[PDB]
Amino acid sequence: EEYTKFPYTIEAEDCDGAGEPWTSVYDTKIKGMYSGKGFAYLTNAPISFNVTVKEDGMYQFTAKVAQILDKGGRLQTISVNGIDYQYTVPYYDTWTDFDFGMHRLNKGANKVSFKPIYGYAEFDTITVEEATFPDFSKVDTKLSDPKATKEAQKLQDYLGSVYGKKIISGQQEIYGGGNDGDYELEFEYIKDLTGKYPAIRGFDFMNYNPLYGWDDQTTERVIEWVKERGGIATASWHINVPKDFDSYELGDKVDWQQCTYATSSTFKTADCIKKGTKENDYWNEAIKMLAEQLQRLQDEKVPLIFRPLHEAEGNVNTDGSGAWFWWGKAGAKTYVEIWKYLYDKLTNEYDLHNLIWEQNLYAWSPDSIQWYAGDEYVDMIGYDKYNTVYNRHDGKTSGPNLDAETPIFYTLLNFVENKKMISLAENDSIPGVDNLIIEHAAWLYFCPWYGEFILDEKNNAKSDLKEIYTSDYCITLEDLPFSK
Ligand SMILES: [Ca+2]
Numbered sequence: 001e002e003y004t005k006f007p008y009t010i011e012a013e014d015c016d017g018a019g020e021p022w023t024s025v026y027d028t029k030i031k032g033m034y035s036g037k038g039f040a041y042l043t044n045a046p047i048s049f050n051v052t053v054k055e056d057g058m059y060q061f062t063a064k065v066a067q068i069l070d071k072g073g074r075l076q077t078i079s080v081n082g083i084d085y086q087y088t089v090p091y092y093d094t095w096t097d098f099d100f101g102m103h104r105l106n107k108g109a110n111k112v113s114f115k116p117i118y119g120y121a122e123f124d125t126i127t128v129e130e131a132t133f134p135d136f137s138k139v140d141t142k143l144s145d146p147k148a149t150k151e152a153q154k155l156q157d158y159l160g161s162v163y164g165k166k167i168i169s170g171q172q173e174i175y176g177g178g179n180d181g182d183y184e185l186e187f188e189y190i191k192d193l194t195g196k197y198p199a200i201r202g203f204d205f206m207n208y209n210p211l212y213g214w215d216d217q218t219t220e221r222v223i224e225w226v227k228e229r230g231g232i233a234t235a236s237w238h239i240n241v242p243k244d245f246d247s248y249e250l251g252d253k254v255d256w257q258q259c260t261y262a263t264s265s266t267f268k269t270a271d272c273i274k275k276g277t278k279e280n281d282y283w284n285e286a287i288k289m290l291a292e293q294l295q296r297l298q299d300e301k302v303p304l305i306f307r308p309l310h311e312a313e314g315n316v317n318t319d320g321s322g323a324w325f326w327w328g329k330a331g332a333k334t335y336v337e338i339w340k341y342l343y344d345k346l347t348n349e350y351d352l353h354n355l356i357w358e359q360n361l362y363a364w365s366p367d368s369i370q371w372y373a374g375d376e377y378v379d380m381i382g383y384d385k386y387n388t389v390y391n392r393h394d395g396k397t398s399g400p401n402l403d404a405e406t407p408i409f410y411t412l413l414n415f416v417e418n419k420k421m422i423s424l425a426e427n428d429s430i431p432g433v434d435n436l437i438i439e440h441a442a443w444l445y446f447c448p449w450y451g452e453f454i455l456d457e458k459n460n461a462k463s464d465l466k467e468i469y470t471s472d473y474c475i476t477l478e479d480l481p482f483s484k
Pocket of ligand 1: 012
């Protein structure tokens with residue numbers, strides 16, 4: 001088995017399945033000059049070549065291409081053995097270098113193919129190089145809030161210091177009242193199994209609301225985690241609205257069964273940021289009760305990775321039709337305005353500056369970036385990865401999905417042009433630690449949801465949990481600098 005020498009360039013016309021070299025797309029010449037005797041015209045049948053490597057590794061794929069069938073661009077597919085990666089190649093009437101991404105080559109032979117999905121593009125040469133990765137250490141971690149507290153900025157800088165070098169362990173605690181009051185169940189499970197505690201603990205402020213609000217002691221547990229155990233805190237905010245908002249009046253007691261965070265309410269999402277509306281009055285009351293708790297944290301000098309208004313896009317859309325939370329119901333543009341509203345309200349009116357603002361993004365399409373509030377309003381990008389049931393592409397149907405989802409990571413990275421750190425804010429399965437390292441899927445941290453998502457081996461196997469939690473690549477509670 002002779003091993004490929006890098007950089008490796010082939011004439012595409014020499015690929016398996018290419019046949020005799022082309023010199024024009026029938027009557028239409030590609031402008032410029034092709035290398036060699038001509039080019040490969042990929043129509044409805046694949047072209048391919050082999051690369052052999054000694055070990056698993058990441059490699060950069062580039063090709064000198066043209067594409068003259070579709071003025072608006074045409075989907076193309078590069079494939080490594082059995083795995084497909086999709087790229088949209090713009091209209092190119094002249095030979096142009098195109099970046100077909102960095103992908104994993106595995107030990108031994110690798111069939112690299114361009115598949116007819118959707119084909120009808122021209123290939124002059126193809127080049128394979130050893131991958132080069134973004135400089136994660138050079139990401140500027142100055143917080144977007146100019147008045148950010150010293151604790152918040154120091155936390156963000158610590159995160160930046162391990163970004164690309166490690167992944168930080170995390171775990172969401174149970175909803176208020178859950179586990180018959182035992183909020184430590186999930187955490188003691190991890191400890192007894194792996195010998196480690198997660199470094200990051202996930203919370204939620206949903207029960208501090210104007211409808212059925214009570215005191216589930218979240219704020220105290222956040223303080224306990226950070227100030228007494230030396231951990232890192234993150235928190236979401238599943239703030240509900242009344243289902244029947246027409247009959248609702250401010251101050252009404254509404255049972256949680258008659259509330260929702262979904263898209264089934266008569267609550268007009270777009271109006272929550274419009275002065276003089278009941279939507280706005282309720283939204284402001286909810287923000288007030290939230291800010292009250294966040295202020296307590298700021299008072300006790302506790303920084304927080306705050307992830308409000310999360311999973312905004314939901315399923316692929318920009319008009320709101322795919323969202324499953326009410327704040328995304330009115331579309332991307334309205335959603336971003338709502339995010340900015342909350343950001344401005346908390347930082348200016350409530351003078352809160354202890355927050356690291358994490359916004360969820362998805363990677364369904366390029367339009368997914370329309371749900372991004374911008375560099376000046378966001379400190380971190382979160383991805384919620386549930387791929388054990390839907391969106392599963394690891395070749396399995398059931399059980400743990402150990403896929404690193406590396407393409408999702410780099411899609412999100414390029415969205416923000418590597419100006420924000422990216423994490424797995426939520427997941428079912430934690431990716432395999434070997435997949436994370438080999439593929440350089442530099443997710444800042446991971447965080448299974450509560451209940452079955454950590455406790456059930458169909459989501460996370462015990463052997464995998466022990467392996468990643470005791471891995472040098474994974475930061476656990478003991479590894480943190482902060483005082484316990
Ligand atoms: Ca050629």
